Design a protein around this ligand. Structure first.
Ligand SMILES: [Ca+2]
Ligand SMILES: [Ca+2]
Ligand SMILES: [Ca+2]
Ligand SMILES: [Ca+2]
Ligand SMILES: [Ca+2]
Ligand SMILES: [Cl-]
Ligand SMILES: [Cl-]
Ligand SMILES: [Cl-]
Ligand SMILES: [Cl-]
Ligand SMILES: [Cl-]
Lengths: 321, 321, 321, 321, 321
């Protein structure tokens, strides 16, 4: 029986690399820790947000570090520095865009420590050779993206360990018992449609790029009966897991998008998100550090006011493992 | 079979928040630890007592710390600073009063560390949505209260861990084999009445606000035969647990009130208290640190002299694993 | 089957208190550790010997500490300071003497650390209420003695942990196969008399105060057939454990007394001692730190010369786990 | 059933020694760590490459250390100092060549720490007395080399522990499903030939010296059907393990040779390598630290281009437990 | 079934003491560690060699320490200081000689730390009272020797722990398949003689003093058929263990003697040695630290050349768990 969609991904890899740039120098120089949030745009180009805890800056060196950070047009909020690395500011943007283009590849939250970037990905083993080959083709003289791990999926939660995140992680579960109120992918209420979903990219800009696991009793047209979904109707059939059809899909919902843009405007984000739809009920699962927890009340207040017809509950908030 | 009344509470939450005030500033600045004792008045408004161990003040910074503490009209006794935060000095008094008003909510001992307040609550799951909603509504008014945990009750003793209390906790058991000499809720000796009890607030001022679990063989009128109980006869029916009726009730006894009033006058208090009544016999259970233990002999001497007909034993004092 | 007499004691308590006195001030001020040996005199007044390791005195503060110690008429020997402290023999309040007077109460070795004394006692549960009541009454006379533990007997060896003794403890077993040559309580050789014994006080002066567990096949008169025992013939019947009659008794033997006075004249002592008599054979069990071990050869040499008809063996010396 | 060829080696030894030379002096004086790679030439003379992490040089003494290192004609690349110790610069070259000449002896990666050299070897118990005797004879000519261990094979992975390598080790698995396109030892595709292989020396120069374990259904001539193998056709029969014939053999393949020369030109190397051939498929197993991993993409790119007909996959990269 | 001769020794004791001498003062003063090797002469008087690791001398205090050491005519070799303490300089020589004279007593390696000497012994329980009595009698002459342990044998390897040896211990096994070429105790080859052996003293001078465990199928005259053994034919029958006769015996072999004198001339020694003879094969077992291992090749080279007819093998060298 398929519960967490993580179960359809039989493979996992830990990508590693270095790009030289003043942020990297100080990271290595002063033992700093960055969280690196992958973001895709409408043309599926990969970029990154960088997050730095203000209180993790050694006071001895604050002056030098701040002067380097300020060159990158930072936003400081809730004790967190947020820096955007556009395609140009981020030389490695072209290999990561290639990896992303491999259908079953799901990007997890990354990090930078000791000047080295770590990015976990989860995927389906048929795509393993394509991933390996683009890493090898990409290889030139000098610094190359490489593999610290590739093999069976150790779990989405291993990704947190792989990137050296030491902070306590929490699991948040939200439930929405009347999602049909939003129409779109929730419009069909008579067929017992059931699916699981996880984004290929944790953050995105004017686009959708999801892995849907759909109970094969139904097809995509059973879901898309109106024009109120976000993104586009297009899909790519990936394969089967048990009694589920796996799709890469370019449509989504506005509620998850809203929550994402509100939270990043507060310089916080989740490490992982996936959702479950069955029996006409929507479940949202977030894995986060405490920063996100502080803002949950405000974020849900905003989300409720922007989606006033939606019934939205917190099922539970639990520390993990 | 229901032993500890904790068993009727299937849910638990850890509330967290911050309020700006000089006490908060020094706590964060100098790594201090406060215990925060919730107190309700007759109008069911929540306030707090703050407790600080004198020997936990770093001596280098004592001068600055003491000058801040003295602005809050402190009482110093038995090596402990006691500070009262009235509704006015304590901005967050209105959300917590709202939480308290939710029938099954029981406040545990709170703390403050790193400038952040932690307050555990235990409750019955039917009231979960009401609690969450007032937290979210509160966030719409500016308030920064949030949840570090909400889900199954991990136990009253998890609360001690949640608030980061590192001190050894002890369990004290008192027994009273002739409570009927106090009359009030103990006046009925003919019926095999049985119940468990725990206060919704650890401390209170001229009021009673209890959760009673009453063996459903009997009703509240079976207990209230005279007018010698403390508080008021009023109740709110909450629901059923096994063969027990659960009530919120506004009546109590003078003996427990006396003990509470004596011990706080000595700047000590328990972390948790509940009681059991069955076979005409009363049991009192206290969970405390060593400060309270030092004063148990004096407190019981006082209690005996004020209630000279009552037979009062120490059944057990044990450290908790 | 009853082996260690510890098995007849179903209860245990850890007494705690403070002596207001300069020895207390320096103990707390300079993180010293005292062993506190309870001693009774002929009138059953409890006093204490205080033991301090000379090499545990921080030299930076030796001058101040020595000047305080010398006010108490110390004896220094084998690197150990020995001080006699009498508080109860004169004034009104005499709490430890009162506890001792409770029949089944057995005092273990105490300690003083962080300005607080810890004193374990073992006893039989029928006497629990009497102990608690005198502690509560004692608090009405000013006295600050309280309970850090009261409940089941965790074992004589828990007492060592309770008083925060970190030193390695050793078990010494002596056997005497011809104790009848001393007469007294060993005079009767024709009846299959069997008993266990432990003193209510680890040290004593011109008195005996024992708990005897006697196989109920026999009575006290079966033992006392001559006049050559030490102390008095008097007993108080305490109760039954299995097939053993429990007595408080005021008679003993000269050999155990001799060993005690020799070793304390050398400023060393055991943490616990008990004995077994069966099949006309005597066993002595000592629990001690290494200080006592160093002097065992000399002490046994002395004991043999003072009791030249006695055959005395070391059965075993083992570290305790 | 034989999986890892390590299973044919029932014996293992840890050789230890000291040679006087300035590299040894600084190694001991400043707590440096060298990896030492045994290398053989066409005349089977053993030499060593020395590897030193640049970032492990204490900056305090960098000047002195670098001046000593530069006397040995170092190559610095990828943060690693590589130094070649030729037979004359390396007095102990005569005993180690003798050990190597013992047929079943396999050299593992060695290390130097605290001025002492550690070199693990794995072998078949048949050769134990010969190894011991040459150590004792070698001693007679000047005592230096000795044994820290000799007995059962604890495993190839124990060798990593023996040399005190603290770095995380990784297992890399490559598979080649069409090795027959290289001809040579892979030319025969019609017979169900199966074997395992491991080099007696981790690195080599213009020579081959392998242990082959060949399923005894076939013989060496069944493998060597053309003239396109590297090295020479010669073998020495060592014995049997289960259903496998063990040979020392002087032929190999060009692909593994290429990978070895490319990686050492980058100052990285594996700790261990072995290969498996069965069902027309070749498996290559590498055990390495992270330095090797960084260069895998470049190394495989080079290997693919020099062997364009070969299908080469990464099966797995896993950290070792 | 009897393997290690340690199995015949059911008892063990740890002797402890102090003798005043400048070596003792400095050991205590500077936290030094000595190994103390018991040695007997032809008159069975016990003396000691003292071993001190040069690199364990704190450089701060080297001058003072060396000046004290040099007064005792030290030999320095292989980084080790060796000092002989003759009977006169070693006041305690007379009690230890008495202990040694007790037939079943076996001396292990001793140590001195914190100015206190620790010496483990193993023996057979019938001799316990004799050992205890000479310790007690000794204490009547002034002597400060005492027992930190006496009871069942915890094993020869517990002795290493008792003396606070922190160094890694190794087990070396030698085998000699043709010991009859040395004649003496190995001359009889036609009877299936089997025995185990361990010296009562780890080192000795012109004497033999062994415990032999001889399979009781045979007697001592069955062994001694020629005059080519070392020492004397005399024995003392100790008793039985299973099917083995236990003897104290004053004859031995020249090969073990040679190895001992060569290794101590290099300032190294074993912690324990015993041997097994059965099926015409001799096994020698050594337990040692690494110092001895460094010199094994030289020692065996020397031993082979002095006994050219003897076939010697290293069976195994393993670290001890
Ligand atoms: Ca279905
Ligand atoms: Ca009922
Ligand atoms: Ca009986
Ligand atoms: Ca076959
Ligand atoms: Ca036999
Ligand atoms: Cl999702
Ligand atoms: Cl209560
Ligand atoms: Cl006794
Ligand atoms: Cl290979
Ligand atoms: Cl031997």
């Amino acid at each position: 029986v398929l519960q967490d969609i993580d179960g359809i991904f039989d493979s996992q890899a830990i990508l590693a690399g270095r790009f030289h740039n003043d942020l990297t120098v100080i990271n290595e120089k002063y033992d700093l820790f960055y969280l690196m949030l992958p973001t895709i745009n409408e043309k599926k180009i990969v970029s990154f947000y960088i997050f730095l805890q203000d209180d993790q800056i050694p006071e001895r060196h604050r002056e030098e570090i701040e002067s380097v950070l300020n060159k990158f047009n930072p936003v400081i909020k809730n004790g967190i520095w947020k820096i955007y690395l556009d395609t140009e500011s981020f030389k490695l943007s072209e290999p990561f865009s290639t990896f992303f283009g491999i259908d079953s590849i799901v990007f997890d939250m990354g990090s930078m420590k000791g000047g080295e970037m770590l990015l976990p990905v989860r995927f389906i083993s048929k795509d393993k050779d394509a991933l390996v080959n683009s890493i090898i083709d990409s290889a030139g003289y000098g610094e190359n993206i490489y593999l610290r791990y590739i093999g069976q999926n150790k779990g989405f939660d291993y990704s947190f360990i792989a990137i050296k995140l030491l902070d306590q992680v929490y699991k948040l579960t939200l439930s929405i018992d009347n999602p049909h109120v939003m129409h779109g992918i929730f419009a069909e209420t008579k067929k017992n449609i059931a699916w699981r979903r996880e984004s290929k990219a944790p953050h995105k800009d004017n686009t959708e790029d999801y892995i849907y696991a759909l109970d094969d009793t139904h097809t995509i047209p059973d879901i898309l009966i109106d024009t109120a979904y976000t993104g586009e109707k297009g899909t790519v059939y990936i394969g089967k897991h048990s009694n589920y059809d796996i799709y890469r899909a370019f449509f989504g919902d506005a509620l998850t998008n809203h929550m994402s843009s509100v939270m990043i405007s507060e310089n916080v984000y989740y490490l992982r998100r996936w959702s479950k739809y069955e029996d006409g009920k929507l479940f949202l699962y977030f894995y986060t550090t405490v920063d996100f927890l502080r803002l949950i009340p405000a974020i849900l207040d905003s989300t409720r006011k922007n989606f006033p017809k939606v019934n939205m509950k917190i099922d539970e908030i639990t520390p993990m493992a």
